[PDB]
Design a protein around this motif. Structure first.
Motif, short mmCIF file in Angstrom:
data_model
loop_
_atom_site.label_atom_id
_atom_site.label_comp_id
_atom_site.label_asym_id
_atom_site.label_seq_id
_atom_site.Cartn_x
_atom_site.Cartn_y
_atom_site.Cartn_z
N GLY G 11 0.85 -1.21 0.00
CA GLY G 11 0.00 0.00 0.00
C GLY G 11 0.87 1.24 0.00
N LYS G 12 2.14 1.09 0.37
CA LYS G 12 3.11 2.21 0.38
C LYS G 12 3.28 2.77 -1.03
CE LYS G 12 7.47 0.64 1.04
NZ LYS G 12 8.60 -0.23 1.46
N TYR G 13 3.22 1.92 -2.05
CA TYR G 13 3.49 2.34 -3.45
C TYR G 13 2.23 2.90 -4.10
CZ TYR G 13 7.61 -0.51 -2.53
OH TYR G 13 8.74 -1.04 -1.99
N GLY G 14 1.14 3.02 -3.35
CA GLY G 14 -0.05 3.68 -3.90
C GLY G 14 -0.56 2.99 -5.12
N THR G 15 -0.88 3.75 -6.17
CA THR G 15 -1.48 3.14 -7.38
C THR G 15 -0.40 2.98 -8.44
OG1 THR G 15 -1.96 5.27 -8.33
CG2 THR G 15 -3.61 4.38 -6.84
#
Lengths: 129, 150, 25, 139, 98, 80, 90
Positions: G11-15
């Motif tokens: 989830g750290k790397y977003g989309t």
RNA sequence: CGCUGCUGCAGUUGAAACGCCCGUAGUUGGCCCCCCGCCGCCACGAGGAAACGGGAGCGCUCCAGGCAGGCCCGUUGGCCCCGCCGCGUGGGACCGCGCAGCGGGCGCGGCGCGCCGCCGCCGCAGCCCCGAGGAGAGCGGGCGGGGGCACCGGUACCGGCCGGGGACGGGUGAAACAGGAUGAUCCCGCCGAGACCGCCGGCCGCGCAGGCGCCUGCCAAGACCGCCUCUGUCAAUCAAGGGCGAAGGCCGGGGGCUAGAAGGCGAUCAGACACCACCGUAUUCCCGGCCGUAAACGGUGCCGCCCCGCGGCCGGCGCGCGCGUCCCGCCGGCCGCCCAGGGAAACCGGGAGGCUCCGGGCUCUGGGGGGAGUAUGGCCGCAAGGCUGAAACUUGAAGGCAUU
């Protein structure tokens, strides 16, 4: 598992009669089996029966005279109102004159005629014609 | 047939009709009780106490010679196992399979026979807590089962 | 195997119908 | 197999409610898709203005030209095809002259060699079709 | 309906058997549904057998036997006449002919 | 043949399974084996599986088997 | 309290970075940050100081290992070979 | 219209047993104590509107009606039905459940008790149905292609290499396309690579199904049998939920011998981008996952009872007997034939028997044939797809089995 002790007993008697066997053995003996057979012995459909003790459920050696035609149980045992007894006799038994419907009553296990005379009804254990 | 397999075997031990002590019996009910207590101190499981009393001694059924079954005699003296022997043996089997699986990840068959063994443990434990035999809180956990055995 | 070939034809047509809905919506 | 326990009345009542739907007749009686679909909409019969007099071919093996009228039902503005019964009866029905249409008698199915005509004319311009055929009343 | 009780294969107490290839047709047939006929023929033809023995220098030589198991599929067997379409009663007869 | 189920034949019963007999009963007996070392006999179980030791000897005198126990050393069966 | 249904630490790397890369990284980065059992002090304290370098927090022992796992699968197979082959000689 | 099935339907093949297993809710649970309390239960009462529906009696001329009438019970108009899941009474067979020690004395407790406390107080047989041809646990003994991992052998296939020898090899049904004096095919030595485990090999066996056969270990199992071992109903079947699931497919790593979806060729033929020959990619193989399906079949759910002989095999055990891998049993399994019996028949008969003479328990599915497993919505998967699943509309048959 063995849910109905009486059904297996009356099936093992009818199968023996069809073979033409005089005596049969019932693997589990119940007090209600003895009462159903006692009724058939007082109606002449069966002969002497002896409950051997194995110190567990007990066995019954049953003597037969070819007289019995069909013996069965109604499952689940449905409580029969007094005025409903005749409707059961018009479908379960052949002829209003012959046959027996065995019903457990507060007075005790009795035939439909005995229940009709005492004007009480009860849960149907089975039937023998 | 079998609860967890489709097997229909009927092998069973048929105890004698007469509840009598044996004619050759010379063991007083108390004397047999001492033997039951002695083996239990050595850690003999309750089932194996009966086999030793049947073979080394002459007591075919302890109930006939004494007045009670082996676990009831053990319970009176307080030397009965805390978790019943049947549940304990099943827990041991699960600990064995779980230990073997930590070296055999691809062993699907042993995992299948671990599901069966642990279903049997939950069902027997559920009975023992309803039977007030086991503390109501007793709930078997896969991770802590190994330490609980001792 | 007409019944299997029928389900192959059906799957091919439902795939196409999905593509048309993907072009819209 | 069936369930026979003194306390399994609930299961039997649920099974009967679920499996009642498999019959087409219970569905065509209780689902309600039929009531919306029917141009008669559950009425014994309907009224409607004639739009087109059409010659419909009979299904094989019969070879004939059945005579029918396309009718837009005043009640739901829905055009149906209705056979005009008897011999030379179509001559009595003019265009746009209003007809009362009832079904054929198969409860919404097409009957006979005629295909797709689930309806038949009973009254033309307020005059019974059978009367105009028996010459009891004039057109 | 069901023509044969065995279902045409000897599969009892089994959910899957090994796969054999029909020798003539090279097809994949289960081991239970295979012709399996074992034949012991002498290495040479019986017409040329005695003259081979006379020619053979080795005394007490015995002509080699060839041992092979010919397995075929039903189509690659009925057409070679190894098995024959039988009458419904004759089909039941499991005894080998002759 | 007038034999009845109520009074079953005595030797016929032992040909039936123990559970399927009219009265369920043990098929096992306790034997009084005689140990070679001690004149006194030792009561033993017929289908013994656990090690049994003859009194006054440190050797197991029972060879366990699938059914009835076999006896390792010389012994007098003297079934009782 | 389940903050994200499918993406985990990714989830750290977003989309950004795609779906395939984020799925591979989920597995790779779970192993990299995992606590492994000390081969020496038998305590689950081993953590990755650097790629190929793993240090037991309690044991204080530093061990050569796989970049993202204390033990690589090839290496375990190699260890078993050497042990068997050494035993064969002796 | 027993075409909705409580009575009372069907599911081997006509429509239809979920691929398998665990499992909660649910439903269902052997035997046992006469005499007690709670339950349901059956009987009988109370009490609660008639009309209606019965139904006493009465000739509206009959009648549907009506409650009238006739010098008459105090002339009538009675009585029943308000399923009333409530209440009262009796029964207590059946149906579930019931854990505590009791009793005496103090004691007549503060108008009689009861709770509560209090003493052993000496009264009390004081206290355990049993050990299911239920189930679990054990012990012993063998059993089997059951499972995981490591190890390893053997050919064959294919590639390479040395020699020898000489011209055609391949391939087919007949050919042809490739292969060859850069020496093919063939023979022999040798080497590499990966797959795979023959004959033995089965009316053998094991496994929950899907499935399972090299050698040598290692690790944990499971059924069965035997049993005077332990426990004491711990059970049965199962929505939801969990795990497993051939092959093909997919996603990462590898690996790559064979075969070989695609693709390319040579034939064939009227055409042939089919069958057949030839070359060959994905794939086939391993590891970590997805997928979740098969004519996943015994097209036959599961647990239980009885049932007729006759054989075969497999595992364990017992009995005689010289004594044999005998014989006769027993138990579990896999099978063949089949007496009844069943069925529309084929067939089943270890049931598809004991069933219009119909009721052991539990789950699932079907209800003329299409439309259509389509549409749409949901859930799931990376996708392929899976799962759940219509209606409008159409049609008079579709289907099973058997005879000619």
């Amino acid at each position: 598992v063995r849910i109905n002790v009486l059904r297996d007993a009356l099936k093992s008697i009818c199968n023996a009669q069809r073979i033409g066997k005089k005596q049969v053995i019932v693997r589990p003996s119940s007090k209600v089996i003895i009462e159903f057979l006692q009724l058939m012995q007082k109606n002449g459909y069966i002969s002497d029966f002896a409950v051997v003790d194995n110190h567990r459920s007990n066995r019954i050696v049953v003597n037969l005279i070819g007289r019995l035609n069909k013996a069965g149980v109604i499952s689940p045992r449905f409580d029969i109102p007094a005025n409903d007894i005749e409707k059961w006799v018009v479908n379960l038994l052949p002829s209003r004159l012959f046959g027996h419907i065995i019903l457990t009553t507060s007075q005790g296990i009795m035939d439909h005629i005995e229940a009709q005379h005492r004007q009480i009804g009860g849960k149907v254990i089975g039937y023998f014609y | 047939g079998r609860m967890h397999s489709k097997g229909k075997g009927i092998s069973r031990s048929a105890i004698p009709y007469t509840r009598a002590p044996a004619p050759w019996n010379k063991y007083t009910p108390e004397d047999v009780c001492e033997q039951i207590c002695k083996l239990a101190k050595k850690g003999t499981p309750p089932s194996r106490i009966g086999l030793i009393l049947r073979d080394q001694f002459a007591i075919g059924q302890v109930k006939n010679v004494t007045g009670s079954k082996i676990v009831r005699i053990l319970k009176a003296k307080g030397l009965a196992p805390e978790i019943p022997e049947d549940l304990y043996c099943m827990i041991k089997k699960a600990v064995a399979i779980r230990k073997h699986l930590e070296r055999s990840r691809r062993d699907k068959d042993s995992k299948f026979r671990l599901i069966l063994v642990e279903s049997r443990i939950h069902r027997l434990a559920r009975y023992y807590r309803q039977a007030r035999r086991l503390p109501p809180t007793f709930r078997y956990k896969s991770d802590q089962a190994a330490a609980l055995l001792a | 195997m007409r019944a299997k070939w029928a389900k192959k034809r059906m799957r091919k047509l439902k795939r196409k119908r999905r593509h048309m809905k993907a072009r819209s919506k | 197999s069936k369930t026979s326990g003194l306390y399994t009345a609930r299961k039997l009542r649920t099974v009967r409610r679920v499996n009642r739907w498999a019959d087409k007749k219970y569905r065509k009686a209780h689902l309600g898709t039929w009531l919306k679909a029917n141009p008669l909409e559950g009425a014994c019969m309907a009224r409607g203005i004639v739009t087109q007099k059409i010659g419909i071919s009979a299904k094989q093996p019969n070879s004939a030209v059945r005579k029918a009228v396309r009718v837009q039902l005043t009640k739901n503005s829905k055009k149906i095809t209705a056979f005009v019964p008897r011999d030379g009866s179509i001559t009595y029905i003019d265009n746009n002259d209003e007809v009362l249409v009832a079904g054929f008698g198969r409860a919404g199915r097409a009957v006979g060699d005629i295909p797709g005509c689930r309806f038949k004319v009973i009254k033309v311009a307020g005059i019974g079709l059978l009367a105009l055929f028996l010459r009891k009343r004039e057109k | 309906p069901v023509k044969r009780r065995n279902n045409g294969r000897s599969k009892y107490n089994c959910g899957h058997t090994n796969i054999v290839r029909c020798q003539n047709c090279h097809r994949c047939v289960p081991k239970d549904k295979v012709i399996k006929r074992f034949t012991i023929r002498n290495i040479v033809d019986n017409t040329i057998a005695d003259d081979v023995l006379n020619a053979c220098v080795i005394q007490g030589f015995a002509i080699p036997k060839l041992y092979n198991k010919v397995q075929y599929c039903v189509s690659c067997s009925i057409h070679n006449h190894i098995v024959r379409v039988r009458s419904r009663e004759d089909r039941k007869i499991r005894t080998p002919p002759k | 043949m007038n034999v009845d189920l109520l009074y079953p034949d005595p030797v016929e019963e032992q040909r039936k399974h123990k559970l399927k007999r009219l009265v369920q009963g043990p098929n096992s007996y306790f034997l009084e084996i005689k140990c070679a070392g001690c004149q006194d006999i030792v009561v033993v179980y017929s289908h013994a599986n656990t090690p049994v030791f003859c009194p006054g000897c440190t050797s197991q005198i029972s060879i366990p088997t699938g059914g009835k126990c076999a006896f390792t050393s010389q012994v007098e069966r003297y079934r009782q | 309290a389940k903050r994200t249904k499918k993406v985990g630490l990714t989830g750290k790397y977003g989309t950004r970075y795609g779906r395939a890369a984020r799925k591979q990284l989920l597995k790779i980065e779970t192993s990299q940050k995992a606590k492994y059992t000390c081969p020496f002090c038998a305590k689950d304290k081993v953590r990755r100081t650097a790629c190929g370098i793993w240090t037991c927090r309690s044991c204080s022992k530093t061990m050569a290992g796989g970049a993202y796992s204390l033990h690589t699968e090839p290496a375990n197979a190699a260890r078993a070979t050497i042990r068997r082959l050494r035993l064969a000689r002796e």
